[PDB]
């Protein structure tokens, strides 16, 4: 029932500043102990810090490696905890996760957010070109056809893909991205569909790349 | 002052594994251990807290113990869902920080071997008008997760302009991957057939496209 939704992730040059938000629903935020853990690309987990409830100190503490550059604060009005980052290093590039924790009736509960990717780098942002991958004539001859979207040459991660505004769930396989020699990412998304529906049903993939402000809805025709 | 776990672990389906963690008196010794599960991609999930108590809504196949300065997570009725990284965690007194173990990659043996399916896409016309032909080779539903991809042009081996993905695990409990061949629009037209050859275990599934 509980959810932790974080955001404000993105790209920021070395020396820069950034603010993550974690918005907590299905939880009495007032009584929730909030914290942040980060995971740098391909490494283990590292605690960043926590903040106590208002009924305690309201106070934060921090891992020594970010002490004084990072500020955790909270807004009980708005059900949200913040992780303010200033003076960022490349070594700060990681997926940042927040945690909410309560203790109700002698039982502990600790829920994690999906995480937000923060890339610290002096390379530039680039949005994708979205191209429709049409089947053929040789696969529009089988009983089911696969068609897709190519999401080409973007940075940083991530990209979301849905189909028909999220209403086409089934037979949908979005692949993880390859990292090109260019430092740019590409991925593909495929949906497999009944071959008799190429003519009636109109298929549109929805691609979002929030760092570039690129939101595309490409029709895949034949 | 670090919490140390063995890097890997392994066992067969339906059986039971133990994963250990050893700290010192200043962390595990003085406080209590928690355990996390992390399937790559997803977030970590709490499994055990205060040494041996089970997190809300968690399989009782998982159980935890603390002996002295070490700690132990145990797993029953081993399913394929269960392979993930496992992290112990405790508060440390001298550092004043929540400290996480090295992490342990559990793998589950005896999983059904499955051959890969392959989808190969030509460059879109839209992309050719920009003179940049990209060939897309999608690879899924296979196990174990080791594949080799070769590309061929008219039976000649294409080595240049290929970018292949490290194989990743799906919601399926099986693996997936992609391979991309990057061409200019006139190399694409210079050959009559291109082909994507995926080899898995010792069998090769091959697919073709033509201009």
């Amino acid at each position: 029932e509980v959810h932790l939704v974080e955001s404000g992730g993105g790209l920021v040059q070395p020396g820069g500043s950034l603010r993550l938000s974690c918005e907590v629903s299905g939880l009495t935020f007032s009584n929730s102990w909030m914290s942040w853990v980060r995971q740098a690309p391909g490494k283990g987990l590292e605690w960043v810090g926590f903040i106590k409830t208002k009924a305690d100190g309201g106070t934060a503490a921090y891992a020594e490696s970010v002490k004084g550059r990072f500020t955790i604060s909270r807004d009980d009005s708005k059900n949200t905890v913040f992780l303010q980052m200033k003076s960022l290093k490349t070594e700060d590039t990681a997926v940042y996760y927040c945690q909410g924790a309560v203790v109700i009736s002698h039982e502990y509960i600790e829920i994690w957010g999906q995480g937000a990717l923060v890339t610290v780098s002096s390379a530039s942002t680039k949005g994708p070109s979205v191209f429709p991958l049409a089947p053929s004539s040789r696969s529009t001859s089988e009983s089911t056809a696969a068609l897709g979207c190519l999401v080409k040459d973007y940075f940083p991660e991530p990209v979301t893909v849905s189909w028909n505004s999220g209403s086409l769930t089934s037979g949908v396989h979005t692949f993880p991205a390859v990292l090109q020699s260019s430092g740019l990412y590409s991925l593909s998304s495929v949906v497999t569909v009944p071959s008799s529906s190429l003519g009636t049903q109109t298929y549109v993939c929805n691609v979002n790349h929030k760092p570039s402000n690129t939101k595309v809805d490409k029709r895949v025709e034949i | 002052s670090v919490l140390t776990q063995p890097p890997s672990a392994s066992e067969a389906a339906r059986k039971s594994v133990t994963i250990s963690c050893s700290g010192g008196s200043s962390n595990i010794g003085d406080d209590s251990v928690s355990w996390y599960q992390q399937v790559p991609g997803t977030a970590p999930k709490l499994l055990i807290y205060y040494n041996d108590r089970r997190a809300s809504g968690v399989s009782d196949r998982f159980s935890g113990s603390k002996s002295g300065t070490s700690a132990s997570l145990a797993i029953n009725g081993l399913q394929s869902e269960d392979e993930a990284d496992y992290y112990c965690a405790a508060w440390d007194d001298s550092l004043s920080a929540y400290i996480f173990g090295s992490g342990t990659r559990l793998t589950v043996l005896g999983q059904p071997k499955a051959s890969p399916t392959v989808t190969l896409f030509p460059p879109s016309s839209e992309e050719l008008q920009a003179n940049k032909a990209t060939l897309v080779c999608l690879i899924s539903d296979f196990y174990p997760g080791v594949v080799k991809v070769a590309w061929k042009a008219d039976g000649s081996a294409v080595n240049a302009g290929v970018e292949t993905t490290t194989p990743s695990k799906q919601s399926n409990n099986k693996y997936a991957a992609s391979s991309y061949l990057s061409l200019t629009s006139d190399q694409w037209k210079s050959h009559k057939s291109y082909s994507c050859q995926v080899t898995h275990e010792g069998s090769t599934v091959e697919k073709t496209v033509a201009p």
Binding site: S32, W33, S35, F50, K52, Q99, V103, Y108, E110 | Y50
Partner: peptide, 14 residues
């Protein structure tokens, strides 16, 4: 006084 987790929540005494 027992604390638990990365948010170091208050859980039990002794």
């Amino acid at each position: 006084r027992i604390h638990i987790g990365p948010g170091r929540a208050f859980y039990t005494t002794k």
